[PDB]
Structure 1
Amino acid sequence: LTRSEAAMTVLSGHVVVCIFGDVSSALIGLRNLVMPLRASNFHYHELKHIVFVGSIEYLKREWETLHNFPKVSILPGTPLSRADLRAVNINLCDMCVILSANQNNIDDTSLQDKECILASLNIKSMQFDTTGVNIPIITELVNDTNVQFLDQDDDDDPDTELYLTQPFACGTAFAVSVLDSLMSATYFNDNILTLIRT
């Protein structure tokens, strides 16, 4: 797509995916996110549309595994562009998903989730003819201590565990560090990994 066709194509109940890709960034593997939405125990009229916003270079470095799926679209823009997020009907989606690929290349532990946090704040600071705070949003963070910047009404404490933090308790944030108990669970009960996988 581009600005024109994105704005005139009415979208509602869709999934908006915000990608901070780069030509040197690692491959996220968006196949694994698309396939559960595309599963066949949903009727075809019930399939939520998917649109990806991000660097066109990174989209043409991953599209080679996403061309057999329906209801998908690309918009070659910036996840932080207010014009793009307005053109994509962000206020009418069933989810916005924010992912970053530049997480391992840099080693600062401060700027790893800066783009995701800024995008989340920009989406929550939007005025619609309702505010942007009620939008359904999920973001993936590399550092668990960065979850304190996602919300402002909640009380922040570095000692507080991620599972106990308000944005995680609400399903607004997700980090790969919560999966570490799957080693122990899998070992004790060999069927649990397949029950979860299915």
Structure 2
Amino acid sequence: LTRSEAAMTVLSGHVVVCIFGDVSSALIGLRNLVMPLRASNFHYHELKHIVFVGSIEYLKREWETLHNFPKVSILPGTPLSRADLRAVNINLCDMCVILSANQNNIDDTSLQDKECILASLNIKSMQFDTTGVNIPIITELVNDTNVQFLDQDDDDDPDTELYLTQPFACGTAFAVSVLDSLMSATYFNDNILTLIRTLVTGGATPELEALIAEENALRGGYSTPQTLANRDRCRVAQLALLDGPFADLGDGGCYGDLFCKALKTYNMLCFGIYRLRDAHLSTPSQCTKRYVITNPPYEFELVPTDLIFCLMQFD
């Protein structure tokens, strides 16, 4: 697409993937971003559109790994130019993902994450006929100490482990180093890596590994009753507690009761909440940032503004 075509192509609820990259840079492996977003678990109307923003010289030499997926588009451009991000309706997306291929070509601890930090600040600082600070962004960081530059309403100290920092606790920063402990976790229990792969990849099983190993591309096939039976598995979802079936209990009520009724009536198995950073404070606040609570105890208190992490069946 060119910027005019994108501006007239009304995009909403989509995913924008900002890629810093170059003709000679190392290949990111974008199939793995697209496949979980293209599981048969979603109805075709439910699939989020994906827009890559970046160098076409980079994207060309990856396209053949993902050209068999629906609702994908490319804008030749830069994540640092306001015009591109306005053309792809950055204020209406469900997620903006910021990635860099240029992680290994220079090593100075500063020079590794410059572009991603500038891009996140560029998006945050925009104005729309709202300011951009409310846009959902996730940034990959090469060096986890640089996390301190992503937020300015937080407390920074380089001795702090990444998992304690605000943008990580909110799920707006991610770094490959948090997978280091997956080695140890997998040694002590081989089932963990199995569960995480099926939960995260879209559910790929050894038959898919074999088919891709033989053919290196995802081969399409005609549908059958067994082909359709494989769609009947759970997908992960976030539910707003202000919705009709649960606002009756998101009023100061009980997480255990919410779990029990959602499980019996819909098989929902909600496994955590996403809680506004200031919602425990007595004063109002303009901060829309949320942080993650995993497996709250039965007696835990439900504020009406909370979001519920849950697993929900196919239909």
Normalising TM by the smaller chain, what interval?
A: over 0.9
1:77-130 CA distances to partner (integer Å, 9 max, x unpaired)?
A: 111110000000000000000000001111121111100000000000000111
Q: Following TM superposition, where does structure 1 have runs of at least 4 consecutive aligned residues deviating by more than 2 angstroms?
A: none
TM-score, normalization by structure 2: 0.62
Could you tell me how far apart the structure 1 residues matched to 2:113 and 2:98 are?
Answer: 10
Could you tell me how far apart the structure 2 residues matched to 1:151 and 1:25 are?
Answer: 28
Could you tell me how far apart the structure 2 residues matched to 1:196 and 1:36 are?
Answer: 13
1:156-178 CA distances to partner (integer Å, 9 max, x unpaired)?
A: 11111100000000000000000
Could you tell me how far apart the structure 1 residues matched to 2:147 and 2:153 are?
Answer: 13
1:24-55 CA distances to partner (integer Å, 9 max, x unpaired)?
A: 11000000000000011111110000000011
Could you tell me how far apart the structure 1 residues matched to 2:110 and 2:11 are?
Answer: 35
> Is residue 2:163 matched to residue 1:163?
yes
Could you tell me how far apart the structure 2 residues matched to 1:61 and 1:81 are?
Answer: 23
SS for the counterpart of 1:140 is: strand
SS for the counterpart of 2:139 is: strand
Could you tell me how far apart the structure 2 residues matched to 1:173 and 1:42 are?
Answer: 26
Which residue number corresponds to residue 95 of structure 1?
A: 95
SS for the counterpart of 2:164 is: coil
> Is residue 2:67 matched to residue 1:67?
yes
Could you tell me how far apart the structure 1 residues matched to 2:130 and 2:77 are?
Answer: 25
Question: How many residue pairs align between the two structures?
Answer: 197
Could you tell me how far apart the structure 2 residues matched to 1:94 and 1:132 are?
Answer: 13
Could you tell me how far apart the structure 2 residues matched to 1:108 and 1:25 are?
Answer: 18
**Structure 1 unmatched ranges of 5 or more:** none
Within a 5 Å distance, the mapping from 1:49-198 to structure 2 comes to 49-197=49-197
**Between 101-110 and 45-54, the greater mean CA deviation after superposition:** 101-110
Could you tell me how far apart the structure 1 residues matched to 2:149 and 2:109 are?
Answer: 14
Could you tell me how far apart the structure 2 residues matched to 1:27 and 1:80 are?
Answer: 21
SS for the counterpart of 1:10 is: coil
Could you tell me how far apart the structure 1 residues matched to 2:123 and 2:167 are?
Answer: 15
> Is residue 2:2 matched to residue 1:2?
yes
SS for the counterpart of 1:174 is: strand
TM-score, normalization by structure 1: 0.98
Cα-Cα RMSD: 0.6
Could you tell me how far apart the structure 1 residues matched to 2:124 and 2:4 are?
Answer: 24
In the TM superposition, residue 152 of structure 1 has moved relative to its aligned partner by 0.4
Could you tell me how far apart the structure 2 residues matched to 1:59 and 1:184 are?
Answer: 35
In the TM superposition, residue 19 of structure 1 has moved relative to its aligned partner by 0.3
Could you tell me how far apart the structure 1 residues matched to 2:111 and 2:132 are?
Answer: 24
**Between 107-116 and 118-127, the greater mean CA deviation after superposition:** 107-116
In the TM superposition, residue 61 of structure 1 has moved relative to its aligned partner by 1.2
Higher relative contact order (Cα pairs below 8 Å, separated by 6+ residues): 1
Could you tell me how far apart the structure 2 residues matched to 1:158 and 1:183 are?
Answer: 25
1:128-150 CA distances to partner (integer Å, 9 max, x unpaired)?
A: 11110000000000011100000
Could you tell me how far apart the structure 2 residues matched to 1:188 and 1:161 are?
Answer: 23
Which residue number corresponds to residue 29 of structure 1?
A: 29
In the TM superposition, residue 188 of structure 1 has moved relative to its aligned partner by 1.2
SS for the counterpart of 1:7 is: helix
